[PDB]
Design a protein around this ligand. Structure first.
Ligand SMILES: O=C(NCCS(=O)(=O)O)c1ccccc1
Length: 345
C-alpha cells in the first residue's frame, strides 16, 4: 500500500469543521504504525477538545457486529443462511420466501421504519430518544408498509433487516445480543472501549458528544449524545472507539472471527453502485487508486463513522465526525479513506 497521507487527512478534518462538524478525527493502524489526528471539540459548550481515544456511537457499524455473530452461528450449525426467516421466527414476516441471507444483504424488501421516524430530523429524535422498543415493536412498524421489492430482488438498505438479525440471535442462542457481542467479539478481541448498553443512555467513560444538525439550514445544533438507541438496537447501538473498530475490522478481514467459508459468504457482493457493494453486514468501497476496502459506515444522531480495512486486514482506518444530518460533512469524511489508503497524489 501507498503511505497514508497525514497532510491530506489533516485537510479532510479541517474541511469537515468548516462544514459544521464540531470535531472530527481519524486513526489509521498501518501494519503496526499508528496515525492519529483530531481537530475541534468533543463538547462544543465546554470547549473540551476531541481526541482519537474518545468513545462514540458507531451507529450502523453495529450491523457488522451482528453479522459476525450470525455467521458464527452458521459455523456452529445453528443457522442456515438460505433458510426462511420464518422458519426460525414463525409468523414474523408476511412472506416465507424471505431468507436470512436476503435480510443480511438488504435484499429482503422489508420497509425501513426509520423513514417514518425521522421524516423530520430533530422532532423524530425527540420522539425516539427516550423510548424503549421491543424487537417485535420495530418489525410491526415496518410491516405497516408493504414490502418494497420481491425477496432477494433488489438492494434497498433497511434497518429492519438488522432488527431481524437481533431477534434471530436472541432466539437461537437464548441470550441477549449484549451477551453474544461480549462473548464472541468484545472479550476475545479485548475491545476495552466497546459496549452495548441498550437501553441505557449514558456513554461510559470519556466520550465525544454528538451534535444533531437540524433540517433548517443555519439552525442551532442539538446535543444528541444521550439516547437509548432503542430504535436501532442490533442495527445501530454499539459504542466503540477508533482503536477498537480498527482492531475489529482487521480481525474480521484477517480471518480471526469466523471460518474461511463464512467470511467468503460475507464478501459475496450485492452491487450498490459502480464503486460500492454490500455483502452480509459488510460494505465494499472502491477507491480512486484502484484499492478496495471493507467495513461499514455509521450514522446515528450526532455521529458519522467510517471504519474500513484492507482485504488482508493489515491497514485499518476509523474516522468520526460528531455531527449528523450534514451531507457535506458525511461526504468530506469519506475522503479519509482516500488519504489513508491511496496516499498522496
Ligand atoms: O438514519 C436515519 N437518521 C439518523 C442519521 S442522520 O442523523 O439523519 O444523519 C434516517 C433514516 C431514515 C430516514 C431519515 C433518516
Amino acid at each position: 500500500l501507498p503511505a497514508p497521507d497525514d497532510t491530506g487527512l489533516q485537510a479532510v478534518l479541517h474541511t469537515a469543521l468548516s462544514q459544521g462538524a464540531p470535531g472530527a478525527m481519524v486513526r489509521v493502524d498501518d501494519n503496526g504504525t499508528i496515525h492519529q489526528l483530531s481537530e475541534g471539540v468533543a463538547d462544543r459548550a465546554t470547549g473540551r477538545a476531541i481526541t482519537t481515544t474518545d468513545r462514540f456511537r458507531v451507529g450502523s457499524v453495529t450491523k457488522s457486529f451482528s453479522a459476525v455473530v450470525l455467521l458464527q452461528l452458521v459455523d456452529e450449525g445453528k443457522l442456515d443462511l438460505d433458510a426462511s426467516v420464518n422458519t426460525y421466527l414463525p409468523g414474523l414476516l408476511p412472506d416465507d420466501r424471505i431468507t436470512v441471507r436476503q435480510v443480511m444483504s438488504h435484499r429482503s424488501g422489508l420497509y425501513d421504519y426509520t423513514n417514518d421516524m425521522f421524516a423530520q430530523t430533530v422532532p423524530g429524535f425527540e420522539s425516539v430518544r427516550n423510548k424503549v422498543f421491543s424487537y417485535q415493536d420495530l418489525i410491526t412498524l415496518s410491516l405497516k408498509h408493504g414490502v418494497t421489492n420481491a425477496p432477494g430482488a433488489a438492494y434497498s438498505y433497511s434497518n429492519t433487516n438488522f432488527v431481524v438479525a437481533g431477534m434471530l440471535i436472541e432466539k437461537l442462542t437464548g441470550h441477549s445480543v449484549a451477551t453474544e457481542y461480549q462473548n464472541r467479539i468484545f472479550t476475545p478481541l479485548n475491545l476495552t472501549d466497546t459496549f452495548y448498553v441498550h437501553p441505557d443512555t449514558v456513554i461510559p467513560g470519556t466520550h465525544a458528544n454528538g451534535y444533531l444538525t437540524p433540517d433548517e439550514a443555519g439552525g442551532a445544533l442539538v446535543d444528541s449524545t444521550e439516547q437509548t438507541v432503542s430504535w436501532a438496537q442490533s442495527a445501530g447501538a454499539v459504542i466503540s472507539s477508533t482503536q477498537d473498530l480498527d482492531t475489529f475490522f482487521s480481525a474480521l478481514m484477517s480471518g480471526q472471527l469466523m471460518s474461511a467459508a463464512q467470511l467468503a459468504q460475507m464478501q459475496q457482493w450485492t452491487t450498490v453502485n459502480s464503486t460500492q457493494g454490500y455483502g452480509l453486514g459488510l460494505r465494499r468501497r472502491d477507491l480512486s487508486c484502484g484499492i478496495s476496502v471493507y467495513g461499514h459506515t455509521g450514522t446515528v444522531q450526532g455521529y458519522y463513522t467510517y471504519a474500513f480495512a484492507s482485504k488482508d486486514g493489515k491497514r485499518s482506518v476509523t474516522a468520526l465526525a460528531n455531527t449528523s444530518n450534514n451531507v457535506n460533512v458525511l461526504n468530506t469524511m469519506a475522503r479519509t479513506l482516500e488519504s489513508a489508503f491511496c496516499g498522496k497524489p
